[PDB]
């Protein structure tokens, strides 16, 4: 719009929706936590850890995970908009104190890729928000199909910090201006290319691939249609790879394999949110046998296979799947 | 040391070397340009481009390349330490005005990976410094073998901003604390693992690989020794992939292939600097037929094949090479 | 209370007010302008001005353009008055909302060179009436819906009131958000600091002369008051709020109407100081009861702890004839 | 001149001086402390203090620890005197170098609450002699090798002299480097602003009373001087440098030795103002000629444009008997 900033944009979307402001507050809270995480990821205050004032305290990765988790939980609970939270970092669902209870359920991965931090890989934060439809709040309120998402997004802490957000009317991209302290709208209603020229998976699991994955990858490298082989990219940090898929097209895959027969990536707070973003941008996201968003979750840390991206590429993959299962 | 900051560390290394301060000034200048580039890469002032004060000006990639190039050139020339500069962004060598001429030659890539910027991939800045040994300065002073490097390094603008620097006594790592505006020493005398478990190349050129590359990659995925296959990673941004190789071990490759018979990566300002860092950290860097640092440059934008990393992995690759050439 | 950030706090107050979001958006817009201004004032990007890649007037103009743009693009405004513009700015019809904003985008900027604390001051009115015009900005201060100031001092602070007291927020530049640091601040009943430019002593009226005399030479055995005068209105007004005492820029022979501007300096700070339980007077009338005649009108200003202002007013009334 | 950044500028001056790098490292250490302090003063990380993840005394202590640590770890120092420490701090023998540094790490911090401009002040001496001790910090100001101040105002600025005039640098927080903004600054011969706390009028000596009278009521038909008093020494001293005039904290009946501290407030600013072509006096003696008796000794301070200080001194000499 003319709204420029994420704060004004979200407020205005909430006015158009005729919201009571409960979701707008939840979204403000999440975005504030994301700003705080960006600052920490970029290492503001590092000199103090290394003894600049005479005090040396040097698991850094574990600390940043705890801090990022603590930022998101405290910001969300203090919004007065939540009843249940599921975090990648916590074994059990976290039930909001009765005094601060609202309507919404949030599933999130506060710092995805933090294992990679030591090599300074792009990392990110992923979230999905549901309405508690349902008696007293419990983990069951977080076990809703991805079709029920009200809002979802991710933050990528890369060369710059970016947020992808959808509330159901397409995908909008915002970049953090650190001099201002605000996210700025840079692309409205982003759409993925119908077909790409990049494929993204860990080919070190080639020995463990099903026949479908083997066939598909072989055709990316050795096409049978006279075209140039696809380029390969795999950062190993899910948000970086998914975001590149969104902006450049192509396909990203973490399929089941012999060692991970149900996949690796987590349904509630990795795969559902990114599937929603990708579908909202005109792409496809599949387990290989059904849309990610149609999977009925059985457990809050359930794993699923994930294949997503440009619709023509995901279709070509699904073709290999059907053919090799027949 | 106790030096804590890069500024004090470099000064003190220059006092121990008994330098006149000319190289210390050159290094201060480069690091200042790197700080300025980090700020721009992270998008400080973006809101002003998008019309916050009423003024909208929205090729952004080309601009950031020009700015990064302009930062490095002006900072280096104004140091009074340089006579010749070679930049990735300029066709010809840039000869320093006589009034500002010093002793050193600098080869640099001011913003490597900038093509990827739109997907927020990690990007970096790479440099190598030589002494003009040699009549009037010309591009010939930049055509020295990598064995003649006096200092070299890279900046990685990733989840945080980091500098790897060597002046010939090993590799030291520094992280930018943005709240302070200084680089902080985080690891002194870093050494690469003797053997890793990650291989990093673009397997989309598989159709174009020589027999050696094909054999090596097949053995990473299908080992013949009872071990687990290697993991694959390839960001497609050279500094990100090289830095991960340094900190985690393994191998990174951009070999010659049918479409790029001399390689893709540039000898003077990509491959020489990273080969020097990697060798200073106890690794190996080869063209496949000789050490990168022994290649005698013929032209300032010459390409070379590059294979580098943990010594046992690079040896295993060189074995495939020798065997398949025999 | 739990809300922590100014964005959440303002939003929650709007929800409590049962607002449509129009004022909330306007406040969000102003606060974004203020963050942009703080960054420029602290000199972000200065190295680029000094040729790394090969003016007080410019910063005045930038700050003015920041505020005008953010406010117009809120869709919440119909009329703006700026210190920097001769005439009122009437918002394009497509972007029109119901609020009128009077502001000084960078107060104190003539003294930028000495790095003195400087600030941004604003007051918001609901338009009453009829096609928009200057007259819509000529409401008395009693009609203010919201007002506040940003001080760019050792840290950046905002003081804001929407009619329920004064709240103080500090910018955390690492987060890029204002954090609530004090709720419902109250000025001391009586302070121990007086603040005016005594370099105009030669031109003071008798009441002012008498009052300053009493501060330095008290007759009741109390310690004399300390003196402070930064010469930057927001810094002096803010110090008076937090420490107490009195701030004065009265009329003098050389400035017979006073110096400070009613619409976008005096009314806003008066509103804050009264919301905090202080007094704000021209020496004739409460500031907030002055009926404005012109958009750049000047008035005298005496404000602060109520007991100190009442003393001043006793001196004025006494010397009247 | 071409050097742009303070780090390059200081390094180049050390190369011109044919230094071994010891002083350069010390300056680098101090400037790093100052950047760390500016960031804390602007309240980076405040949201974490207010519970986002679930004190003026603390900032005094942090600033003090920043400076002590950076200076000790330079390997350039043998003795430090801080405003914050009773006793001199003797550097561990392993880290000892030849310089003695007297500093106020956060001057003005008692008034942090009102967000007043505040600063950091330092002076550096070469040790003369013999095992290190307090006595090594009791050199007169004439022996200063380098001195300066950081002002944390609307922007962060450093004023530095190493004996060749005064240079001014501004922090670009986007780059994290100080940028040269003025070389070899010279104070005006005569200014138009006087700066003191006239709340002590009741306790002034006759010379001070007479002088202030002349500023407000000149007898030669000139306009009276304007008054400014921030109450923060670095802000008032810096304004006097850039705009001219006079700054006074003389002895009075209540503070008979004066208030400001010789080693780490008065000597450093005197050194800067004299290097800029101004005067700095106790009213008895130039500050820089005072032979210090004790590390926390107090002295009167009058400084600024030379023509204005000489007028003050004429008033002092005149009223002596
Ligand atoms: N800021 C917003 N942006 C987009 N949709 C919104 C917003 N606020 C509310 N909505 C929609 O309105 C519904 C109810 O809002 P609420 O009353 O805030 O719970 C949400 O569940 C959304 O579907
Ligand atoms: N800051 C430094 N760190 C490491 N080595 C240095 C430094 N300064 C100088 N040297 C070494 O001393 C040589 C001459 O220094 P220069 O007189 O500064 O040209 C360099 O070419 C280096 O080999
Ligand atoms: N964010 C807010 N904080 C405090 N009061 C508000 C807020 N928003 C609205 N109000 C009150 O409700 C009125 C109507 O708001 P609006 O419907 O946005 O024009 C305003 O003029 C205020 O008096
Ligand atoms: N960075 C510098 N800037 C200006 N003068 C300096 C600098 N470094 C050293 N000097 C002068 O040379 C002397 C010796 O320096 P040093 O050898 O480092 O102790 C100092 O006491 C100064 O008078």
Short key terms for the protein model shown above:
homotetramer; 326 residues; alpha+beta; Fructose-1,6-Bisphosphatase, Chain A, domain 1; D-Maltodextrin-Binding Protein, domain 2; 2 domains; five-stranded mixed β-sheet; globular; binds adenosine monophosphate; hydrolase; gluconeogenesis
Q: Could you walk me through the main structural features you see in this protein, from its secondary elements to its overall organization?
A:
- 4 copies of one chain form a homotetramer.
- Helix content of chain A is 32%, strand content 21%.
- Chain A is globular.
- Chain A has 2 domains: 1-190, Fructose-1,6-Bisphosphatase, subunit A, domain 1 (Fructose-1,6-Bisphosphatase, Chain A, domain 1), CATH 3.30.540; 191-324, D-Maltodextrin-Binding Protein, domain 2 (3-Layer(aba) Sandwich), CATH 3.40.190.80.
- The N and C termini of chain A lie far apart (49 Å).
- With 326 residues, chain A is α+β, with helices and mostly antiparallel strands.
- Chain B binds chain C through residues 32, 36, 44-45, 47, 51-55, 67, 70-71, 73-75, 179, and chain C through 32, 36, 44-45, 47, 51-54, 62, 65-66, 68-70, 174.
- Chains C, D: It catalyses: beta-D-fructose 1,6-bisphosphate + H2O = beta-D-fructose 6-phosphate + phosphate.
